[PDB]
Ligand binder design. Structure first.
Ligand code: NWE
Length: 236
C-alpha cells in the first residue's frame, strides 16, 4: 500500500495473508474470506506454486511479526484458478482457496459479502484497498496492515491510461488523477472493499497496473460482480 495508514484489529476481518513455505516462508499474496472455507484471491499469485502443499492462510493477523512457528493457520485443500486465466494484465485474475477446515467467525476474522444481485448500477463512493504490500516499487513487505481510500474511475477513463491493454467490463479501476495512493507488490489477491448502505462489499481483487501509484495510472482490479456466478458454481 502506497500512501496508506495502519489499520487496527478487527477493521478488515475478511483480509488474509497467504504465505508460501518454499524456498522460504513469507507473505506471498492477500485474500478475502468469502465463506466458512473459502478465500477469494488472484490467480497470478500461484505462478510457480507447484501444489497447495506449500501454502498457508493466516486470518486474524494485524502484524506479520505476530506469525510465529506456533501461530495457527489454515491449510489449503484446493486452488481453483479461473479456467480462462493466462496473464494478470489480460483478466480472469481470480482464484478460490478451499481451506482444509472451517473458519470460526470472530471480530478478527469474518466473511465479506460479494456485490449484491440488484446493485449493478451502484456508484461506490467509499472504497478501500488493504494489504501488507510494498509502499514503493523497490520496497519490502510491511509489518502492519495498511489501508487506502481510493476513488473508482470509469472503464472508459481507465482504458485511456492503458492504451496498450484491453480494459474489459470484467475489470474495475481505482486511482487518483495525480497518483499518491495505490496497492503495490504483496497486495494482489486482497480486497478492494467498498462500503454501501453501511455494508461492506468485495468489489474488486487487487491485480495490476503500470508502476505503483503513478499519476494518471489507476490500479486495475478483478470486477468481482462479474464473476459472482463462477464463485457460486464453485462454492456450492
Ligand atoms: O502480484 C503481487 O502483488 C505479488 C506477486 C505474486 C506472485 C508473482 C509476482 C508478484 O509480484 C508482481 C508485482 C511486482 C511489482 C508490483 C506489483 C503490483 C501488484 C499490485 C498492484 C500493482 C503492482 C499496481 N497497482 C495496482 C495493484 C506486482
Amino acid at each position: 500500500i502506497v500512501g496508506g495508514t495502519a489499520s487496527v484489529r478487527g477493521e478488515w476481518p475478511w483480509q488474509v495473508t497467504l504465505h508460501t513455505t518454499s524456498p522460504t516462508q513469507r507473505h506471498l499474496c492477500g485474500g478475502s474470506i468469502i465463506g466458512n472455507q473459502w478465500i477469494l484471491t488472484a490467480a497470478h499469485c500461484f505462478y510457480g506454486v507447484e501444489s497447495p502443499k506449500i501454502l498457508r492462510v493466516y486470518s486474524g493477523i494485524l502484524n506479520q511479526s505476530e506469525i510465529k512457528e506456533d501461530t495457527s493457520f489454515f491449510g489449503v485443500q484446493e486452488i481453483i484458478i479461473h479456467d480462462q486465466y493466462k496473464m494478470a494484465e489480460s483478466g480472469y485474475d481470480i482464484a478460490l482457496l478451499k481451506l482444509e477446515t472451517t473458519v470460526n467467525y470472530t471480530d478478527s476474522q469474518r466473511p465479506i459479502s460479494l456485490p449484491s444481485k440488484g446493485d449493478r448500477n451502484v456508484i461506490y463512493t467509499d472504497c478501500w484497498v488493504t494489504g501488507w504490500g510494498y509502499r514503493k516499487l523497490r520496497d519490502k513487505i510491511q509489518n502492519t496492515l495498511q489501508k487506502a481510500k481510493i476513488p473508482l474511475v470509469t472503464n472508459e477513463e481507465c482504458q485511456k491510461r492503458y492504451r496498450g491493454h484491453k480494459i474489459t467490463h470484467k475489470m474495475i479501476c481505482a486511482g487518483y488523477r495525480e497518483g499518491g495512493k495505490d496497492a503495490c507488490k504483496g497486495d494482489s489477491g486482497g480486497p478492494l472493499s467498498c462500503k454501501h448502505n453501511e455494508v461492506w462489499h468485495l468489489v474488486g481483487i487487487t491485480s495490476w497496473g503500470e508502476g505503483c501509484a503513478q499519476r494518471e495510472r489507476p490500479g486495475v482490479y478483478t470486477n468481482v460482480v462479474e464473476y459472482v456466478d463462477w464463485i457460486l458454481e464453485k462454492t456450492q
